[PDB]
Amino acid sequence: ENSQSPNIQPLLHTENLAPAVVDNVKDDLIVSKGGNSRELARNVPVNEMVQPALGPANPFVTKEQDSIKNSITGYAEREYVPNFVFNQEYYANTHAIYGKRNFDDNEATTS
Amino acid sequence: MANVELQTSLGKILIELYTEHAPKTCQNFYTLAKEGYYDGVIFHRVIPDFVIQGGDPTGTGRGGTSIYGDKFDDEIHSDLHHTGAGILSMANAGPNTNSSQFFITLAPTPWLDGKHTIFGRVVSGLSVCKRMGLIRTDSSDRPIEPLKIIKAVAL
Amino acid sequence: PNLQMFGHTAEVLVARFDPSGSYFASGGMDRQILLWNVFDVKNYGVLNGCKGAITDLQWSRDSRVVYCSSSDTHLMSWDAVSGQKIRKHKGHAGVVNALDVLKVSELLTSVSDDCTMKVWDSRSKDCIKTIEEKYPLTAVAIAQQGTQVFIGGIDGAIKIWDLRNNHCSHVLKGHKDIITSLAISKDGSSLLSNSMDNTVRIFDVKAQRQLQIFEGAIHGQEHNLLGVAWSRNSRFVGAGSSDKNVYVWSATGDLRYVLPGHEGSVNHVDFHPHQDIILSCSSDRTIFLGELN
Amino acid sequence: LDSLPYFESTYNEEDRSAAAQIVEEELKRSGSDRLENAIVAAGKGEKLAAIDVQRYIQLKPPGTRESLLQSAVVWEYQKSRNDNLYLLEKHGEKAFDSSLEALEVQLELLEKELVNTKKLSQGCNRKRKHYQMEVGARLAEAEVKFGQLLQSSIQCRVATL
Amino acid sequence: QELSTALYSLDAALRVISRLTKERDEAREALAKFSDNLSSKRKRTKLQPKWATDDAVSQLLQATPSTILENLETESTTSFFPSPENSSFVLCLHKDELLCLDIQSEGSALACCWLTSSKIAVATADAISIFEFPVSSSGLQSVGEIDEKVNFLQAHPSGEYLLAASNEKCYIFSKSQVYNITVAQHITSLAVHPDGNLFVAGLENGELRFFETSSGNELTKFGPHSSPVKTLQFGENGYWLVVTTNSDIFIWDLRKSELVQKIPLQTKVAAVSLDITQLLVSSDGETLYVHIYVKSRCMSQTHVSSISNLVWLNELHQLLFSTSNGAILRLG
Amino acid sequence: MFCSISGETPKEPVISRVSGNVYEKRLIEQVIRETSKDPVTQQECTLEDLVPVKVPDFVRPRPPSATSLPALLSLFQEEWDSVALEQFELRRNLTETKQELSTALYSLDAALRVISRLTKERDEAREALAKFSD
Amino acid sequence: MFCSISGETPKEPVISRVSGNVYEKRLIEQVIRETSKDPVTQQECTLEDLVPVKVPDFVRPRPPSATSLPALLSLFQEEWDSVALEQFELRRNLTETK
Amino acid sequence: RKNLTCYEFLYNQERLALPNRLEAAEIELSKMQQIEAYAQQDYARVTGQN
């Protein structure tokens, strides 16, 4: 009675740990592979999306190589900020720069 | 304690496997080589005077799985270290994340001792691993001509 | 597929399906509502007239009449079959910010910068009720019952008002700042709410406490009104952010899908009534139909 | 009928022993050949093989007319034997190793079927796994909603008084 | 393939129970802790008005007093059969009030069975014999010989065979004689189910053993009683069994094999005899009681002095009969 | 490579055209005369319907100690021992499978009654919690 | 063991049901796609007509050996059929001597 | 082969049992919603008397 029960339960549970994990992982990679390299066309969960590189990491790598650069100096990408925000942002930053050169905080802006 | 033969587009590589030390690491590798899993795969990383990693079915960098399921635990011993030029060892993405990927050192690497699971050393084809490890590359350390694995034989 | 359709000239705000699930409508700063198909993804009418920019569409539950909420006080009305004007619900003395509709398509609620909520009948051309608070209002939602109307303001206090009583029955608490969109479930049993604190909180309708504070969807200097939705099941929650990402939640307090794609700030995310599709809009002049197989 | 194997991780051996007793209590309640086959079944049942001709090997010199025959039997079979060992040695090991090659073609075919069965067996279990995880979630959704009513119905009644 | 598919699906269906049992259990403490805080048949109205209408004391010897067993002829219930303390078996006619036969032949008579043919009667006794008698010849035609007291006697549906139980731990069909090695104890009573395929035997160690006659096998055992089984009765509905032991009567549904009702009398009460009419169940011992089976008490008689040893229904329940240690045969 | 009747390695294999399965000619020729149909698929099949197949022939190395004597005495004795004690043991295996079948189906139907009994039990216990609220 | 079309050791043997001969699946498949025929006899054959090599069913076999009862019986034919010719060598030579 | 035919059979008998499992709980949920749907109304009618 106890021997036949232990065989059937191990048969039911342990069978899906090997091939079903690799088959679903391959189908997960295949949808991401069909999605190309730099455009997530397959709508995967956030946890599955990341997928780290793996390897030993090149040891020599100087500071200059490490950053990902679209245009030599740095990565450059398009932005869609309403201009009023940018103009508003820009002025505040300038005052701080002048203030250090001025060396005066000039209090806080008020009503 | 069985060997394996790799046929590439440059030359043949024979490798001993320390299965006595690492049973699972030489269970995974040996099974995939025989099945026809490493067939037609590129050595996607090549670094002059460091390594030439492989074992990428997807051909991406973030690919490959084990015979167990997805990833398995490392098995480190102090007997096996990276002192030499031509040492088979498994690549990983942390402590317990070994996929199919392995690599072959071209010089001594003390700093990789304790992280990666070593599981073999190259007997014959040491001229192929030096010649393969001096191929033109892109800035993303990828070879300009894809150095394929033609056949994996299990001896 | 995904389908990133182009068409508008300037920042688009609101994009919604019919209750049926056979169209889009969309329209922002263009002063042009552009209707669409779902299943050969082509345009239809250019509903033209609004002399202020659009801030909120909503289909009539007949799937024929459309209602806008322009920046010039008007709330327009459109025959989506023909594409002619019906009315100009002239009322507020400022910019309208939100709209909401009932089962019975007859009653509408709007929300001004005059700090005035107003309920409208689609037959009078005038206000039925006028609820004056104090600080300019922003988001509104009406229940399925046709009873409770939820108001969202600048205090972080989602107030609740009935149509019989007209009393400050309850006030939601624990939201530090600004509300950009309310949203009642397809039950009538819980709200959604985007604050400027980036806490995309759920609330109860009947005891009236929180349920789950979601956290991870930033608002910033843009000051756009960002949206939230309930999925057709009421399993998933779809909140957009000014980080160019559509943060879909699991409603159990778990981030599942976080899909980028937009190049600018996102506004009003939506869900299709049956098949799993996501309308996502953004200043960018673009819109997506993100699916799940 | 429904019992989720992959999803139910809290099924102990005590629960098998418990359920076995309840199944046991419901069981307490319910409570072509000819002559060939006759001698073959009798030989197997009795555990005795029929005796063969134990004669040719032993025999004896100065016998009689009987051993004159037995002697002449040994010669002809010994000549047939020495001719039967000649045609074997002529080919030798070539005829043996040719059959050894056939046995390797026969063996590998079985282990290919071991793999084909292995793949389709794991493939069926793989489909079941997804179904288990689909519904086990839906059952989790149902139970959460169940517990919500259970306390909701109470908190309505508590206030009505 | 059938073996494999079954064993897998069996232990699969077994896990349904494990799940089901724990949920059922959760429902109990939850609710518990919350709730805490035939046109001729005489119908019950008429039956309830019955009274003693006769009491006959002269069937059996005055000097060896007592009647120990009762049966009525199924084909004419005015023919009464009694077993006496006096070692005699008596046939009596209720209509004429005459003793038709006094049947003699070495210990008290503790079981009697009346054949539907009217001319055959059967008895059994602590003398270890079963006797078959001719009424018209007033003779014993067979003496069937158990090694100790015969405790129960039942006529098979065919009318051709008798089942007996004994303190010697065997039952017999009179052709075969069987015991349970495992149970190994005295059998205290025996009755056939009315279809004649199965029967029950009560035991001294409080079991009701159900047997398959054809296979001669013990197919089920009903536990739950304490003390010796005293009496069992199968209903003509074919699915009820009533059992009694040393002060409850338990009711069993044979389709479910479950005890669905128990009538618990006081611990002094002795239940010695059970019989269904299937509308009514009678019990006798300390006294006579009749229950309606549909709703589970409609009559209660206490006329006998000392133990009542037998009870029976006349045809259509038009009368009740009882026998006593006090010497009497009573009709109600 | 084998025959699909006896479990042989055939000397003259022949394939049937209704069901692609290789049998040894003698054994398939016997089945068609007994009842003219294919043994596996139970489809109509005749002797003319069969197709003989060719292969590089099968080779058995006759043992080094091979004479008329062991082949008559020791080898032939072992063959009719091995046929006798196997089929008797195989008849023993078929008898237990039918007994272990009966223990399977009874224990199965015993479980069905538990489920049916517990299906009435559970939902009514859940129903009572629903009624309790009132 | 061999494929009759190429002469190699076939890694996927499939036997045809018109000319009984073991072909390699990948080779014979191309022969059928060229023209629906069997290469040896030139009789009509389709891809569904071809059948892979299989384990018989449920009866377990053992390799062809000298022990096996049928192989032992065909052996005793060889014994007697050869000894019958041995008798002719002495019957024919007796008819010359006498 | 035995385990293949097992897992083949286990698939077919299981796949039908789940709809029946769910559909029962689905109807079980529908009834629970009704008690929730009414109990509110009696609370709602507390405000009418005030």
Short mmCIF file of N, CA and C in Angstrom, two decimals, chain A residues 40-47 49 77-82 84-85 88-89, chain C residues 2 221-223 244 255-260 263-265 283-284 290-292:
data_model
loop_
_atom_site.label_atom_id
_atom_site.label_comp_id
_atom_site.label_asym_id
_atom_site.label_seq_id
_atom_site.Cartn_x
_atom_site.Cartn_y
_atom_site.Cartn_z
N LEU A 40 12.17 45.64 -27.37
CA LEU A 40 11.37 44.57 -26.73
C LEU A 40 9.97 44.45 -27.33
N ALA A 41 9.88 43.77 -28.47
CA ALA A 41 8.61 43.53 -29.16
C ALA A 41 7.75 42.42 -28.53
N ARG A 42 8.35 41.60 -27.66
CA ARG A 42 7.62 40.58 -26.90
C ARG A 42 7.32 41.09 -25.49
N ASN A 43 6.04 41.08 -25.11
CA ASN A 43 5.59 41.76 -23.90
C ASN A 43 5.76 40.87 -22.66
N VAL A 44 7.01 40.77 -22.20
CA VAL A 44 7.38 39.91 -21.09
C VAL A 44 7.28 40.65 -19.75
N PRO A 45 7.01 39.92 -18.66
CA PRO A 45 7.10 40.49 -17.31
C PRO A 45 8.45 41.14 -16.99
N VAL A 46 8.42 42.12 -16.10
CA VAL A 46 9.61 42.91 -15.74
C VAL A 46 10.76 42.08 -15.18
N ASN A 47 10.43 41.03 -14.43
CA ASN A 47 11.45 40.17 -13.83
C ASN A 47 12.17 39.34 -14.89
N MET A 49 12.34 40.16 -18.08
CA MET A 49 12.88 41.06 -19.10
C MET A 49 14.38 41.32 -18.96
N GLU A 77 19.89 60.84 -26.82
CA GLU A 77 18.56 60.40 -27.20
C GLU A 77 17.54 61.53 -27.20
N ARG A 78 16.49 61.39 -28.00
CA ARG A 78 15.46 62.42 -28.12
C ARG A 78 14.64 62.57 -26.86
N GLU A 79 14.14 63.77 -26.63
CA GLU A 79 13.36 64.07 -25.44
C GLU A 79 12.09 64.83 -25.79
N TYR A 80 11.07 64.71 -24.95
CA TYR A 80 9.82 65.40 -25.18
C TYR A 80 9.37 66.09 -23.91
N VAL A 81 10.04 67.18 -23.58
CA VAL A 81 9.72 67.96 -22.40
C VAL A 81 9.03 69.22 -22.88
N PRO A 82 7.88 69.59 -22.16
CA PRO A 82 7.28 70.84 -22.66
C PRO A 82 8.29 71.94 -22.46
N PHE A 84 8.22 75.00 -21.70
CA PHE A 84 8.06 75.88 -20.55
C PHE A 84 8.76 75.25 -19.36
N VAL A 85 8.68 73.94 -19.22
CA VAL A 85 9.41 73.26 -18.16
C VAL A 85 10.91 73.44 -18.34
N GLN A 88 11.85 77.05 -17.63
CA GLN A 88 11.70 77.27 -16.21
C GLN A 88 12.85 76.62 -15.45
N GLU A 89 13.19 75.40 -15.86
CA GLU A 89 14.28 74.66 -15.24
C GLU A 89 15.62 75.35 -15.44
N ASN C 2 1.81 45.19 -32.24
CA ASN C 2 1.79 46.31 -31.29
C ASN C 2 1.05 47.54 -31.82
N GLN C 221 7.90 67.77 -13.46
CA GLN C 221 7.65 69.19 -13.74
C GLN C 221 6.61 69.42 -14.83
N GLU C 222 6.48 68.45 -15.73
CA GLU C 222 5.51 68.52 -16.83
C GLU C 222 4.12 69.00 -16.37
N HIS C 223 3.64 68.44 -15.25
CA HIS C 223 2.31 68.72 -14.69
C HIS C 223 1.15 68.29 -15.59
N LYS C 244 8.12 57.54 -19.30
CA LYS C 244 7.98 56.91 -20.62
C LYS C 244 7.57 55.42 -20.55
N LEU C 255 4.27 44.42 -9.58
CA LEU C 255 4.53 44.91 -10.93
C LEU C 255 4.83 43.75 -11.86
N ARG C 256 3.95 43.54 -12.83
CA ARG C 256 4.18 42.53 -13.84
C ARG C 256 4.80 43.16 -15.09
N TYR C 257 3.98 43.79 -15.92
CA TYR C 257 4.47 44.36 -17.18
C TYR C 257 4.87 45.81 -17.00
N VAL C 258 6.11 46.13 -17.38
CA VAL C 258 6.60 47.50 -17.43
C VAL C 258 7.19 47.69 -18.82
N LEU C 259 6.35 48.11 -19.76
CA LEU C 259 6.78 48.23 -21.15
C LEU C 259 7.01 49.69 -21.53
N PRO C 260 8.24 50.01 -21.99
CA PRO C 260 8.52 51.32 -22.56
C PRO C 260 8.04 51.38 -24.01
N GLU C 263 8.59 58.03 -26.42
CA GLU C 263 9.76 58.89 -26.34
C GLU C 263 9.53 60.11 -25.44
N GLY C 264 8.30 60.25 -24.94
CA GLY C 264 7.91 61.40 -24.12
C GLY C 264 7.01 60.95 -22.99
N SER C 265 6.46 61.90 -22.24
CA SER C 265 5.67 61.56 -21.06
C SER C 265 4.37 60.90 -21.47
N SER C 283 2.21 62.60 -24.93
CA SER C 283 2.78 63.74 -25.64
C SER C 283 4.01 63.17 -26.33
N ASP C 284 4.01 63.27 -27.66
CA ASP C 284 4.79 62.40 -28.55
C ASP C 284 4.04 62.28 -29.85
N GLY C 290 -0.60 47.52 -26.89
CA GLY C 290 0.15 46.44 -26.27
C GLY C 290 -0.75 45.27 -25.92
N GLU C 291 -0.33 44.07 -26.31
CA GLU C 291 -1.16 42.89 -26.16
C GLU C 291 -0.52 41.87 -25.24
N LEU C 292 -1.31 40.85 -24.92
CA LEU C 292 -0.84 39.66 -24.23
C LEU C 292 -1.47 38.46 -24.97
#
